[PDB]
Structures are given as C-alpha cells and as structure tokens.
Coordinates of C-alpha atoms and ligand atoms in Angstrom, one line a residue:
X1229 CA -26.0 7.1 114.2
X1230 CA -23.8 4.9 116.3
X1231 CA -26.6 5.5 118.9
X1232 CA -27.9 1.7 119.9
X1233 CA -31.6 0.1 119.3
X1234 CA -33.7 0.3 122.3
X1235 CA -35.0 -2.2 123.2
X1236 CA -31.4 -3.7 123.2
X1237 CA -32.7 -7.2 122.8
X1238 CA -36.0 -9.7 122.0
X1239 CA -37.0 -10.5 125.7
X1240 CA -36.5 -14.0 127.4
X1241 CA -39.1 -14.9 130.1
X1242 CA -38.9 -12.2 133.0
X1243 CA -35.0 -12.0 132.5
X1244 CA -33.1 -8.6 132.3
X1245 CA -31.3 -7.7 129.6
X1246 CA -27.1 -7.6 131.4
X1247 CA -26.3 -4.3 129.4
X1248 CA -29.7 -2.7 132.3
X1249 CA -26.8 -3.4 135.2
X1250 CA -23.9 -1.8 133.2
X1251 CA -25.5 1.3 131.8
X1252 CA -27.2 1.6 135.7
X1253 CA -23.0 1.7 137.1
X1254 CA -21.0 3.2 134.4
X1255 CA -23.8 5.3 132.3
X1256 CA -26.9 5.4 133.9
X1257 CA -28.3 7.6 131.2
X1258 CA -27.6 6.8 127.4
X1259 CA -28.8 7.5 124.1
X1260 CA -31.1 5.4 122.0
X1261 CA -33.1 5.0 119.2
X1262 CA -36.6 3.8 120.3
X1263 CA -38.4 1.7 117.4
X1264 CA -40.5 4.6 116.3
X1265 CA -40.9 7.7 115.8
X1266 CA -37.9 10.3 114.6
X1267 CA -34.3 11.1 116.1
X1268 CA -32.8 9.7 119.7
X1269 CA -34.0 9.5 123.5
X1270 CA -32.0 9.5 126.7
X1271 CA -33.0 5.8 128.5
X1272 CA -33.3 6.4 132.1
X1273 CA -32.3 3.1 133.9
X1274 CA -31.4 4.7 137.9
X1275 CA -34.4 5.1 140.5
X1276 CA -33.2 8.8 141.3
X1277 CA -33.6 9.4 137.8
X1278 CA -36.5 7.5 136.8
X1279 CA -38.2 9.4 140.0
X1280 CA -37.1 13.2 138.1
X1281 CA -38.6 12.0 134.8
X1282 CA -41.7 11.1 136.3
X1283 CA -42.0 13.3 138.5
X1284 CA -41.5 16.8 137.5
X1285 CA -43.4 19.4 135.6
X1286 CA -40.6 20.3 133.1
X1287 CA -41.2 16.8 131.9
X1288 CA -44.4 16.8 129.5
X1289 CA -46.1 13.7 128.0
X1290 CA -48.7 16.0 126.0
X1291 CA -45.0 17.3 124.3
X1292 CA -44.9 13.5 123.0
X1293 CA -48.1 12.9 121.1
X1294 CA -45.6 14.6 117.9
X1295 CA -45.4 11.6 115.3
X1296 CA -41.8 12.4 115.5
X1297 CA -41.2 12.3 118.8
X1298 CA -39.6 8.3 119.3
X1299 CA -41.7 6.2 120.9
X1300 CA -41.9 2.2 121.9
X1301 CA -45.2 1.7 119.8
X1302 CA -46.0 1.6 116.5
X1303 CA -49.2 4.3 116.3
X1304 CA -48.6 7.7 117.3
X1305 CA -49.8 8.3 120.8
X1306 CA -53.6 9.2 120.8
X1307 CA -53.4 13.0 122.1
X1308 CA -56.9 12.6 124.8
X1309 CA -55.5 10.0 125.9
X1310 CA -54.6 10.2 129.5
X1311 CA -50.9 9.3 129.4
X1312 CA -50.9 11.9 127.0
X1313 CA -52.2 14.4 129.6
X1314 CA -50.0 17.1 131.3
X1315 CA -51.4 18.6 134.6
X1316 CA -53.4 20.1 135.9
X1317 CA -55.6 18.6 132.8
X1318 CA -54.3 15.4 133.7
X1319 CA -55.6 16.1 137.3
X1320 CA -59.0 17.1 136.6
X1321 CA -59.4 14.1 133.9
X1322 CA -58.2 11.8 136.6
X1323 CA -60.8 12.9 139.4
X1324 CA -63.4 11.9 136.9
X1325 CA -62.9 8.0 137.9
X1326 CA -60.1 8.4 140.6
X1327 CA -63.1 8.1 143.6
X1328 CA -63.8 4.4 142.4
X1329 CA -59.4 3.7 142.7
X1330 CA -58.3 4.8 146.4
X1331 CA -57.3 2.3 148.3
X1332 CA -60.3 3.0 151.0
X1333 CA -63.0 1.5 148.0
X1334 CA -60.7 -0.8 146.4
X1335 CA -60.2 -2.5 150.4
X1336 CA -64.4 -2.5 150.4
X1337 CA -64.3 -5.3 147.1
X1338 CA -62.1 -7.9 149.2
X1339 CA -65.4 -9.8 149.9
X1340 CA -66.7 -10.1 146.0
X1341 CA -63.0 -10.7 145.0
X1342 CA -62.5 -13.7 147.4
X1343 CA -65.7 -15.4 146.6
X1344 CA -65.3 -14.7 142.5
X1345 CA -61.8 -16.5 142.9
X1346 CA -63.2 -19.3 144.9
X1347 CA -66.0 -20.1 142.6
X1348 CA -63.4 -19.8 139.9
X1349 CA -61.2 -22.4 141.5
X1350 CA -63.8 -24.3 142.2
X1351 CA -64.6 -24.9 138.5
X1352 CA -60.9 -25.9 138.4
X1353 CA -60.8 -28.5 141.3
X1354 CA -63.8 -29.7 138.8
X1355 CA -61.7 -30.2 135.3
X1356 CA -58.9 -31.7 138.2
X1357 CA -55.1 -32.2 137.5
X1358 CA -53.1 -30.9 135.4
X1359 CA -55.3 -27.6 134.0
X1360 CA -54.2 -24.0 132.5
X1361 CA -54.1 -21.7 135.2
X1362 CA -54.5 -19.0 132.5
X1363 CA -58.0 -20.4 130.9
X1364 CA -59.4 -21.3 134.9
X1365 CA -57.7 -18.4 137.0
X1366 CA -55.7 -15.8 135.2
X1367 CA -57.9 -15.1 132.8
X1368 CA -61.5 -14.8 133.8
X1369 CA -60.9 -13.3 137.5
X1370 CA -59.4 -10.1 136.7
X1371 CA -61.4 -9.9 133.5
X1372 CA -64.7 -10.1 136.0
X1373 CA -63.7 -7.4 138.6
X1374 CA -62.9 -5.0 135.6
X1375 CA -66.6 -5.9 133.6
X1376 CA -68.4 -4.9 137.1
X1377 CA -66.8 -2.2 138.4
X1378 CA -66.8 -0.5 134.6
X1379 CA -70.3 -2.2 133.7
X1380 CA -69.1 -3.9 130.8
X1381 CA -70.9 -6.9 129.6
X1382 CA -69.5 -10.2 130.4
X1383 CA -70.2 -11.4 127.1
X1384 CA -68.0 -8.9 125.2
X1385 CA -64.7 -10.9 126.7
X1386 CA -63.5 -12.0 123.9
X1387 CA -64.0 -8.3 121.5
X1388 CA -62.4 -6.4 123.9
X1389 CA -59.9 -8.9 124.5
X1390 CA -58.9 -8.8 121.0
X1391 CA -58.9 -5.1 120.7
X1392 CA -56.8 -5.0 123.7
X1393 CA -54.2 -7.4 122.7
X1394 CA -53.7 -5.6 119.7
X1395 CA -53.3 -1.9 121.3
X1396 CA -50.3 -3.6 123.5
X1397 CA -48.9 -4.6 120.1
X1398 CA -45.0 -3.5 120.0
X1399 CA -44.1 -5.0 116.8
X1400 CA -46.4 -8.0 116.2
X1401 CA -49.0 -5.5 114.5
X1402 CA -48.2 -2.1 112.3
X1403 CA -49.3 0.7 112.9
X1404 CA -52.5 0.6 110.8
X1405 CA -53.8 -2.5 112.6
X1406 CA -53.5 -0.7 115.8
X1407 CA -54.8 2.7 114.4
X1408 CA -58.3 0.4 112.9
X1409 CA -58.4 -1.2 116.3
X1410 CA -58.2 1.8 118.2
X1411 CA -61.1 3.7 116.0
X1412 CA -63.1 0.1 116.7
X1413 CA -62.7 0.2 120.8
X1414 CA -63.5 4.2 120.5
X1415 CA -66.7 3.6 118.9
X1416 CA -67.7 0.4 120.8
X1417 CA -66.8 2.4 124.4
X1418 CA -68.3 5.5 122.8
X1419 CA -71.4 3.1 122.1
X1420 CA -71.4 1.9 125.8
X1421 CA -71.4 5.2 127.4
X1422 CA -74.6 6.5 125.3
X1423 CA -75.9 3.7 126.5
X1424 CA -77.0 5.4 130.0
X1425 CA -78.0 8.6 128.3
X1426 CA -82.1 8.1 129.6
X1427 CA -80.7 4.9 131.6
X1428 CA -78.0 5.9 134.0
X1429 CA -75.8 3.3 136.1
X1430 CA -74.0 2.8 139.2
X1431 CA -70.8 2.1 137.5
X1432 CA -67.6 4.0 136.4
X1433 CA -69.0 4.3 132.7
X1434 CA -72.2 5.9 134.2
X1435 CA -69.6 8.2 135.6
X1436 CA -68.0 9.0 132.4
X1437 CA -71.7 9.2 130.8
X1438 CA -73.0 12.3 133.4
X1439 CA -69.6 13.9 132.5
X1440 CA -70.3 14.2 129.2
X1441 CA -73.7 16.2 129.6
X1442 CA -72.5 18.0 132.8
X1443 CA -68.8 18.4 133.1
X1444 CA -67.7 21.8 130.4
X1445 CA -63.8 21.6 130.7
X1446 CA -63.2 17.7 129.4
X1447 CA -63.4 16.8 125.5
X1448 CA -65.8 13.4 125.1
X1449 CA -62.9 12.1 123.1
X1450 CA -60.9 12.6 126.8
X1451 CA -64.0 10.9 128.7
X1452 CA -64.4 8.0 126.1
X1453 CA -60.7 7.5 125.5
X1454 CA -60.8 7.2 129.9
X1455 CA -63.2 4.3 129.3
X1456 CA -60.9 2.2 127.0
X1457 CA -57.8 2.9 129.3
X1458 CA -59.5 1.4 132.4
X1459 CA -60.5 -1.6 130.3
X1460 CA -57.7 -2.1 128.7
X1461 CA -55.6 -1.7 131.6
X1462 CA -58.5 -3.3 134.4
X1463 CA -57.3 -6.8 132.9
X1464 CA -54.2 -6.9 131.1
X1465 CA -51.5 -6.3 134.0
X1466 CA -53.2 -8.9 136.5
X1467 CA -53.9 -11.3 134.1
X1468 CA -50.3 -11.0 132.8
X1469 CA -49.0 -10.4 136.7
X1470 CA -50.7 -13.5 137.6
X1471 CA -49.0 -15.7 135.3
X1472 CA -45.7 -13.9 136.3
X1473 CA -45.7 -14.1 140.1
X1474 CA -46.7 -17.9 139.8
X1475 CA -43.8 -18.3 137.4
X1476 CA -41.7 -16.7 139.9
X1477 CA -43.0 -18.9 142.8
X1478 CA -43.1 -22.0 141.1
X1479 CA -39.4 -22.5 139.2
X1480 CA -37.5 -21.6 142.4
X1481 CA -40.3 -24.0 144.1
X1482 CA -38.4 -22.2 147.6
X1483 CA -40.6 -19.0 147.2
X1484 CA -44.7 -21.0 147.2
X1485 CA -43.2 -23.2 150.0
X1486 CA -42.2 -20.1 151.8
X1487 CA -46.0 -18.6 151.5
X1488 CA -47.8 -22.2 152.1
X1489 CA -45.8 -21.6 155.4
X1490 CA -46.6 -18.2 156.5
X1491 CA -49.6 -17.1 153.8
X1492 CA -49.5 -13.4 155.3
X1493 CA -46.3 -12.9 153.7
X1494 CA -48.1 -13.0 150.6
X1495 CA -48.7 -9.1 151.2
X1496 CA -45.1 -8.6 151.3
X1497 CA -44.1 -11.2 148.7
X1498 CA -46.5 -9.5 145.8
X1499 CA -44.9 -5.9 146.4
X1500 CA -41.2 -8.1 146.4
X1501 CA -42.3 -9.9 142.6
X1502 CA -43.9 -6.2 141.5
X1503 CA -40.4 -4.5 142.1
X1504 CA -38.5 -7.9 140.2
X1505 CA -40.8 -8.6 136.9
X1506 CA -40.4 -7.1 133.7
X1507 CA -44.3 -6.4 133.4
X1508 CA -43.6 -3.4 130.7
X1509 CA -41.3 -5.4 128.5
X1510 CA -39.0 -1.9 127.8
X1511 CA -39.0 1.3 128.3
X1512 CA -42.0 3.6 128.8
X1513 CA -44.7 6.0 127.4
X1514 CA -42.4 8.8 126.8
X1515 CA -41.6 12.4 128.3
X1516 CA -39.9 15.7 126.5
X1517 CA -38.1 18.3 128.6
X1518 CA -39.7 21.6 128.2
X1519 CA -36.7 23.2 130.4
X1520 CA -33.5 22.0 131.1
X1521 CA -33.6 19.5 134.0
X1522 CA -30.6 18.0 135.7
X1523 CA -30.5 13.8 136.2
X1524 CA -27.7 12.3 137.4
X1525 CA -24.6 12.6 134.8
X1526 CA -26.8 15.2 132.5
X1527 CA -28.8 17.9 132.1
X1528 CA -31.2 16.6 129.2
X1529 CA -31.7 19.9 127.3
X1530 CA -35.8 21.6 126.3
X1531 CA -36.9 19.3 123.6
X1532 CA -34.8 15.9 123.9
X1533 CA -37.5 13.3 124.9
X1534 CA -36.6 10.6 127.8
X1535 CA -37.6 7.1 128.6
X1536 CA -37.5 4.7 131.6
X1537 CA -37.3 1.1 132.0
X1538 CA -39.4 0.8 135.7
X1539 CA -37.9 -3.0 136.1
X1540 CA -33.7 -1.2 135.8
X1541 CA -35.1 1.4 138.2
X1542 CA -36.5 -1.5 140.7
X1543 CA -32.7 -3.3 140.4
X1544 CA -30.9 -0.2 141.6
X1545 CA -28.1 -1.6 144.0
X1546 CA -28.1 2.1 145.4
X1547 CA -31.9 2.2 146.9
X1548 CA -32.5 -2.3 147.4
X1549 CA -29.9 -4.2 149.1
X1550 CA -29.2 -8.2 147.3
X1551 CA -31.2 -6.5 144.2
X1552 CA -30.9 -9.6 141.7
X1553 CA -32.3 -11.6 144.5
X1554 CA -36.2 -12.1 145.8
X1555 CA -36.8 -11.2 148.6
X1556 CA -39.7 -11.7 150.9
X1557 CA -38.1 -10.2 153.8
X1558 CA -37.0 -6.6 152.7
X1559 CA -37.4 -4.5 155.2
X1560 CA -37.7 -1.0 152.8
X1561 CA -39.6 -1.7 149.2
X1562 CA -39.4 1.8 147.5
X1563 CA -40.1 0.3 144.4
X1564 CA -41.6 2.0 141.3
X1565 CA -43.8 -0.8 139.7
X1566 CA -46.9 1.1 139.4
X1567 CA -45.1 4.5 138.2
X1568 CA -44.5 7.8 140.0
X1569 CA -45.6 11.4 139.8
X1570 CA -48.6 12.3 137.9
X1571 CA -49.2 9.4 135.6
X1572 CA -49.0 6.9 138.9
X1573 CA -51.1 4.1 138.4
X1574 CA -54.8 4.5 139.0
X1575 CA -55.6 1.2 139.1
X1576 CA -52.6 0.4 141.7
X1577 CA -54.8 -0.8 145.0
X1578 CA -56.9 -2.8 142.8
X1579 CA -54.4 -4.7 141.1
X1580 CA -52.8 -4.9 145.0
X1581 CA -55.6 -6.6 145.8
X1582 CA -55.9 -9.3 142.8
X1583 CA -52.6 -10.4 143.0
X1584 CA -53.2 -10.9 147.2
X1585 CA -56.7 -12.5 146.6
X1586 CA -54.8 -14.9 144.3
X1587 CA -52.2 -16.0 145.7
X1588 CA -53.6 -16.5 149.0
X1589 CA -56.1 -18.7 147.6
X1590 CA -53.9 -20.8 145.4
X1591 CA -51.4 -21.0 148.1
X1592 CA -53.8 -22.1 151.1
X1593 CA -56.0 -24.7 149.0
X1594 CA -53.1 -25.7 146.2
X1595 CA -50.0 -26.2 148.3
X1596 CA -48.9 -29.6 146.0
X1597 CA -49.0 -26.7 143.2
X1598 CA -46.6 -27.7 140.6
X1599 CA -45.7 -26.3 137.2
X1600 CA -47.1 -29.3 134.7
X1601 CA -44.9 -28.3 131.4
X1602 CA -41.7 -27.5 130.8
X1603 CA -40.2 -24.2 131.5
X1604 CA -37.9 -24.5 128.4
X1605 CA -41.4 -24.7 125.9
X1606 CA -43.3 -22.1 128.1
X1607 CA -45.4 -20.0 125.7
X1608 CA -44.3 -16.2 126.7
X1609 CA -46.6 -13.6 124.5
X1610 CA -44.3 -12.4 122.0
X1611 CA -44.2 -8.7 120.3
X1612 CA -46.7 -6.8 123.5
X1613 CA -45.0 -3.9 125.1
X1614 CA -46.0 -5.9 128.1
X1615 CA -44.6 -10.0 129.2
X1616 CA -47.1 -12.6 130.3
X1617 CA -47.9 -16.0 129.5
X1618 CA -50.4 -17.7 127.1
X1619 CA -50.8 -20.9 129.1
X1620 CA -49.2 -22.0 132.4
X1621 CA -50.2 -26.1 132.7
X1622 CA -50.2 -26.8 137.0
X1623 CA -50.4 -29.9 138.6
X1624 CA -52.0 -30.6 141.8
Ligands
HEM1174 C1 -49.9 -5.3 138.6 C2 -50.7 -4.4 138.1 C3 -50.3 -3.2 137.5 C4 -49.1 -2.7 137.2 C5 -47.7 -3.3 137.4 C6 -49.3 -1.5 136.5 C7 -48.2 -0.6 136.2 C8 -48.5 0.7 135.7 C9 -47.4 1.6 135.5 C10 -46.0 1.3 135.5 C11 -48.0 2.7 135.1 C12 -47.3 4.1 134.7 C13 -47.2 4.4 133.2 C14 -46.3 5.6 133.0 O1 -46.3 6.6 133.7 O2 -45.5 5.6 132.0 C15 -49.4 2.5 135.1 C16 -50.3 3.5 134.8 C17 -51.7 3.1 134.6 N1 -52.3 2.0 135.1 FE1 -51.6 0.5 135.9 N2 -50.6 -1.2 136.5 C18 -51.3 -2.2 137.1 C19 -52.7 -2.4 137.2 C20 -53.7 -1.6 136.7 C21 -55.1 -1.7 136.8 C22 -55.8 -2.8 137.6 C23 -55.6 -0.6 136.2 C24 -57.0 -0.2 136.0 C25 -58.0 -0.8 136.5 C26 -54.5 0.1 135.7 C27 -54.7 1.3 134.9 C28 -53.6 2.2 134.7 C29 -53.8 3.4 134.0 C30 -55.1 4.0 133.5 C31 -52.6 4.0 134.0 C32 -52.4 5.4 133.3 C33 -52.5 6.4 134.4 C34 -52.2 7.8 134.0 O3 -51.8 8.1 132.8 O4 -52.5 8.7 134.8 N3 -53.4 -0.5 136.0 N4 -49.7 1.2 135.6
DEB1175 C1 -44.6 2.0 126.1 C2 -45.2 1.1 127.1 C3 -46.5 1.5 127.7 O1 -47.6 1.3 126.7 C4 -48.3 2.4 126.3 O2 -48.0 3.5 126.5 C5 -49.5 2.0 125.4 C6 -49.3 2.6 124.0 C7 -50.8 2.5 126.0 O3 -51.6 3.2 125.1 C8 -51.6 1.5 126.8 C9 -52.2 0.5 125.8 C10 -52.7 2.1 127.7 O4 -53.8 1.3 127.8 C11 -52.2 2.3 129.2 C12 -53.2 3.1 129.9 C13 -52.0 0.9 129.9 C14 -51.4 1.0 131.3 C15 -51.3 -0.3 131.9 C16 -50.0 1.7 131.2 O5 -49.9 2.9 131.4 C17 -48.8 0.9 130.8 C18 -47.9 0.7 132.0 C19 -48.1 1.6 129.6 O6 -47.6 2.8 130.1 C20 -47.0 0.8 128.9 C21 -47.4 -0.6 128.6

C-alpha cells in the first residue's frame, strides 16, 4: 500500500527514531507493514495504549502464531512457546518456574551475585587499563547467574550463546537459519531435561523435568520450549542492558559522577535508564484483537493484529515529565520496560538486581571509569531485534 515499513529506520546507538514523538502527538496509532508475515498492523506508540494491548483479554498472542499474521522476525512464532500463550494456559505454564522469579527469592541471591561480580572484577583489575567491559563484566556475570539457577553447564557458553544470538536475529539471519537453530536448542534443552530423569536437581530444569512425568495439562514441547526461553532470555537483556546503562553513564560523564556521589541512587537510576533505552530495537511480539477493543483514536476491529514499541510508550510526555531527558530524580517511574499484563517479564526482579549489583560495584571501586574508544566507531550489534554492544573498551 502507501502504508510505511516498520521499523521506520536501521537503528543508531540507543537513539529514537523522531517520527516515535510525532505519531505519539498527532497519530498515536498508525498503520504499518512489519517485515514479515502478510497484510498491516496498527503500531502502538502511547503508554495508555500500549497498557490496553497488553493488558486485556480481547488481545491474543496464541491468535499470532498464523505465518500470515505480520510479525518483526523472520520464523513464524513457535506456537508452545510462552509468548505465544493466551491465559489461563499462559498462567498455569508460568507457575511452573514463576516460584524461582518473585522478587522475595530473587532478593535471597544478592549475596552470590555480589561476590560473582567481585571475583569477576577482580580478574579485570588483573588484565589492568584499558579492557572490554563486555569480555570481563558484561558477559560472563549474567551468563553465570542464568547457568546456576537453570543448571546449565558452564562449559556450554559459547553453544548456547550462538543459538541465542541467532533466535534474536531480525534480519541478519533467514528464516531457515533460525528455524535449524531453533530445532538445535529444542533438542540440546530437551537433552538437558532428560538428563534428571533417575537424577533429579535442585534447579529450575529439575523443575521442568518432574513436570514432564507428573504435571497432565502442559505439552513437553511447552515445558522444553520454557527452558530455552529462560536461557535465552536469563542472559541476553543484562548482558545487552549492561553495555547500555554504562553507555548511558559514561558519554554524558554527568550521570557516573552523579552515582560515585550518592551510590544508592543506583536503585533509582537503573529503573530511570530501563524506561530511556531502546533494549527491543522495534516493536514487539505481536497481539490480534479477538473483539473490538477501543485505544485512544480507534477501535482496532476482531482480527487486525497490533504492535508496541515499549521505549515510545516510556517517552510519553502525557505520563513522565522532561521525557527526552534522564532523570535520576523522578519522583513517579510508571514505566513499561519489562512489559505489562500477562506476558510481564518473569525474569524482571532478577535482571533488577544485575543491573544494581553492577553498577554499584563499578561505580564504588571504578570511579576514574572512562570510555577508552571512540563513541563514533562503537560496535553496536547489528540486525538483533534487541540493541547492545559487542565491545565497550574502559579506562581506569
Ligand atoms: C533488563 C532486563 C530485561 C528487560 C528489559 C526485559 C524486557 C522484557 C519485556 C519488555 C518483556 C515483554 C515481552 C512482551 O510482552 O511482548 C519481557 C518478557 C520476558 N522476559 Fe524479560 N527482560 C529482562 C530480563 C529478563 C531476564 C533476566 C529473564 C529470565 C531470566 C527474562 C525472561 C523473560 C521472559 C521469559 C519473558 C516472556 C514472558 C512471557 O511471555 O510471559 N527477562 N522481558
Ligand atoms: C519482536 C521482539 C521480541 O522478540 C521475540 O518475540 C523473539 C522472537 C522471542 O522468540 C525471543 C527470542 C524469546 O526468547 C523471548 C522469551 C525473549 C524475551 C527477552 C522477550 O520476551 C523479548 C522482550 C521479546 O519479546 C522481543 C525481543
């Protein structure tokens, strides 16, 4: 049609594509034709909205797993998956692991968090001035807490790291790389679980394993596919987060003076950089109407599919005063970094709690940290549905 390409543009750093700010005051929801999939979707770019779409039960994410349905990724979306659950299936799925995820547990690994980042920039005091905050922090930390808490050997970094990469491939892989991949990290995790058949563990993939023999209402596929998610997921938004929030700190050099200063702003200051980075390059995983649902300007009709773009929803002048500013003062934070309704991030106190144990660390024993390479040749992963950065050269 004359409909516009979403995403609009080929991203730049953690910037925000302009057109976000016009469609947000003059049409907040617009057609577009997502790089997949068949026919248009409405892109939801307000909070109010964004909150609707994700939030009620005339919007189905089960209705999405059509091949035709658009979509920001090139492989139709794997139908047990748990994005691709409607509730209450989606509820029951989720109580499987969700015990492991409140934030009452996730508070109870501060301890082993601390110490594994301390030993970690230990070995980076070691190597000394100027290293890659990505190979000696970024990296292996989040990748550690993820391999425990799953039971995942240590050793299988750099498999699972590949698989990974690859099923956050927007356009850098098709869609028959990603389908291969995705049969590859079913079997391995599929492997993994069997594993504790006669040999159970206390770990989340023991979990998954005793639902297989004694749970009757959830498909294996469902209890396997859970088991990739968490992996997948467990490390690739903090180690991506981690790159980004230093970014943020380090450019505007303001910000990591600010927290050297008063470290227990970090709290504050990590909820402030969730609501302001791009983390999910563009758009979403999508939803379809079922019913006619009124948003803001239109009532989106049974059928016609929606997608939102969390980072436009955190920029709404209408819900966060000085929006296209950081701040680590805001008084409110209502933000929507970690999702809404249903499909709300599992994983959302632990990656909380990364990011904190992180940056209070770097900015109590590194407060000469410096970016060591130049912004303009930064190496920003190219063609992920998700932004982060390859390498990230300090000085100390
Ligand atoms: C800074 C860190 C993180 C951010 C910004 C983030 C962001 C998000 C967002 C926006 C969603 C919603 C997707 C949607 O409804 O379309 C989500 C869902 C999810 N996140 Fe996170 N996430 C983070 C950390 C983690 C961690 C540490 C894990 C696992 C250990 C994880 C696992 C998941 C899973 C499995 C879902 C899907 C949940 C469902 O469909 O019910 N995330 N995350
Ligand atoms: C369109 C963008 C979205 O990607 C997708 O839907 C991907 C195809 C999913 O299969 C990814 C690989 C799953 O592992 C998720 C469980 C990861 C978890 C972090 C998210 O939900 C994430 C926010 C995600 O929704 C977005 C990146």
């Amino acid at each position: 049609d004359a409909v516009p390409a979403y995403p609009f543009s080929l991203p730049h750093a953690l910037d925000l594509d302009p057109h976000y700010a016009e469609l947000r005051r003059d049409e907040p929801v617009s057609r577009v034709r997502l790089p997949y999939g068949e026919g248009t979707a409405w892109l939801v770019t307000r909070m109010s909205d964004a909150r609707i779409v994700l939030g009620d039960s005339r919007f189905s994410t089960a209705a999405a797993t059509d091949p035709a349905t658009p979509r920001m990724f090139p492989t139709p979306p794997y139908p047990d998956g748990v994005l691709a659950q409607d509730p209450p299936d989606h509820t029951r799925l989720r109580r499987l692991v969700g015990k492991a995820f409140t934030a009452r547990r996730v508070e109870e690994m501060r301890p082993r968090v601390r110490s594994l980042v301390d030993s970690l920039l230990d070995d980076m005091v070691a190597h000394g001035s100027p290293a890659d905050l990505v190979e000696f922090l970024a990296v292996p930390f989040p990748v550690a807490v993820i391999c425990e808490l799953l039971g995942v050997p240590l050793e299988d970094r750099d498999l699972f790291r590949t698989f990974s990469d690859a099923m956050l491939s927007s356009t850098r892989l098709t869609a028959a790389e990603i389908q291969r991949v995705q049969q590859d990290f079913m079997v391995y995790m599929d492997g993994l679980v069997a594993q504790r058949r006669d040999a159970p563990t206390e770990d989340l993939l023991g979990a998954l394993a005793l639902a297989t023999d004694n749970d009757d209402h959830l498909t294996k596929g469902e209890i396997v596919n859970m088991g990739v998610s968490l992996l997948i997921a467990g490390h690739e938004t903090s180690v991506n987060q981690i790159t980004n929030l230093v970014h943020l700190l380090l450019t505007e050099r303001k910000r990591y003076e600010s927290l050297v200063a008063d470290p227990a702003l970090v709290p504050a200051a990590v909820e402030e950089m969730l609501r302001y980075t791009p983390l999910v390059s563009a758009g979403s995983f999508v939803r379809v109407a079922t019913e006619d649902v009124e948003l803001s300007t239109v009532t989106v009709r049974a059928g016609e599919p929606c997608v939102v773009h969390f980072a436009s929803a955190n920029r709404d002048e209408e819900v966060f005063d000085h929006a296209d500013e950081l701040d680590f003062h805001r008084e409110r934070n209502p933000h929507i970094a970690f999702g809404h309704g249903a499909h709300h991030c599992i994983g959302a106190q632990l990656g909380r709690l990364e990011l904190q144990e992180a940056l209070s660390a770097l900015v109590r024993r590194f407060p000469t940290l410096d970016l060591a390479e130049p912004v303009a040749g930064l190496k920003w992963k190219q063609g992920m549905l998700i932004r982060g950065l390859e390498r990230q050269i300090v000085s100390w």
